[PDB]
């Protein structure tokens, strides 16, 4: 995640494995339940798009709804392209690329990106977009299933 | 010639600021040349004269040709919708390269721009497809114009443009 470092500037940390582990057993625990949502989100503070991919990706079993979370998510990435046209090039020097929706899901963009464009000034925030897109699958299968 | 030259009398606020001529590479791109050079003499009844350069980052470039809407969010080719990357045999090697701006691969129209550095990190990205010949000066001149964000401090026009050779 990226968290805010109390001397100033926001910095990088790996992946914690507790807050993993914590998200795991409330996946375990309660099976799809509304209670679910609110956890996702208490947990996955400054997360970048390659950790919320690792929290949901770690989920054991449930493949069904996991394919199904993926299919709001690379809808919701596809929306969000056709409304944002991507801006003119070219790129002028130290800029990095402006991210699509993809990019924002984490499909075809790397940490080193996703760490740039959250970094930035002012930060580009494909986490909290990301996670937004999360939310609303995770709401669809909690409806499924509960 | 092969090759062909085109030229652009640029203005400020309706002043003449001067000509800036360049050559076209109609031998290693001639699809690009040819899209450009058509624009440049208004020959399918629409083009650059009367654009305005709307982007120009001191340093970077100066950007110009959306002559359908003024601000980046327009433009089109003679082709009849956005065409795509030709080759990337040529370079970004320095001040006067012209190269073809996109917003992602295969969508080139009429925006275009001219270096005034050297733009490694832009090779493979946008078509290398002229470079100036005479008043590399105006061009800076331009720069003169720009800003940060590319936002440009007064009205630069291409007030007048064709082929000469």
Same mark, same amino acid.
């Given at each position: 995640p990226i968290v805010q470092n109390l001397q100033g500037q926001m910095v990088h940390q790996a992946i914690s494995p507790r807050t993993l582990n914590a998200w795991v057993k409330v996946v375990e625990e309660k099976?799809? !339940?509304?209670?679910?949502i609110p956890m996702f989100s208490a947990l996955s503070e400054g997360a970048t798009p390659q950790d919320l991919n690792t929290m949901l990706n770690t989920?054991?079993?449930h493949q069904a709804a996991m394919q199904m979370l993926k299919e709001t998510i690379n809808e919701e990435a596809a929306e969000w392209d056709r409304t944002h046209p991507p801006a003119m090039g070219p790129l002028p020097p130290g800029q990095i690329r402006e991210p699509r929706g993809s990019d924002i899901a984490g499909t075809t963009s790397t940490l080193q990106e996703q760490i740039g464009w959250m970094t930035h000034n002012p930060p580009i925030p494909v986490g909290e977009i990301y996670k937004r897109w999360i939310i609303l699958g995770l709401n669809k299968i909690v409806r499924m299933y509960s | 010639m092969v090759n062909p030259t085109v030229f652009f009398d640029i203005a400020v606020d309706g002043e003449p600021l001067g000509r800036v001529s360049f050559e076209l590479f109609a031998d290693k791109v001639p699809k690009t040349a040819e899209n450009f050079r058509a624009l440049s003499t208004?020959?399918?009844?629409?083009?650059?004269?009367? !654009?305005?350069?709307?982007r120009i980052i001191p340093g970077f470039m100066c950007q110009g040709?959306?002559?359908?809407?003024?601000? @980046?969010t327009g433009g089109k080719s003679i082709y009849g919708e956005k065409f795509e990357?030709?080759?990337?045999?040529?370079?970004?090697? @320095?001040?006067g390269i012209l190269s073809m701006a996109n917003?992602?691969?295969?969508?080139?129209?009429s925006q275009f721009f001219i270096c005034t550095a050297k733009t490694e990190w832009l090779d493979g990205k946008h078509v290398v497809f002229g470079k100036v010949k005479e008043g590399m000066n105006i061009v800076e001149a331009m720069?003169?114009?720009?800003s940060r964000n590319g936002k440009t401090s007064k009205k630069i026009t291409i007030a007048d443009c064709g082929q000469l050779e």
């Open positions: 099976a799809f !339940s509304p209670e679910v989920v054991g079993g | 208004g020959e399918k009844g629409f083009g650059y004269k009367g !654009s305005c350069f709307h040709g959306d002559f359908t809407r003024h601000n @980046g990357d030709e080759n990337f045999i040529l370079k970004h090697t @320095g001040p917003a992602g691969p295969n969508t080139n129209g720069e003169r114009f720009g």
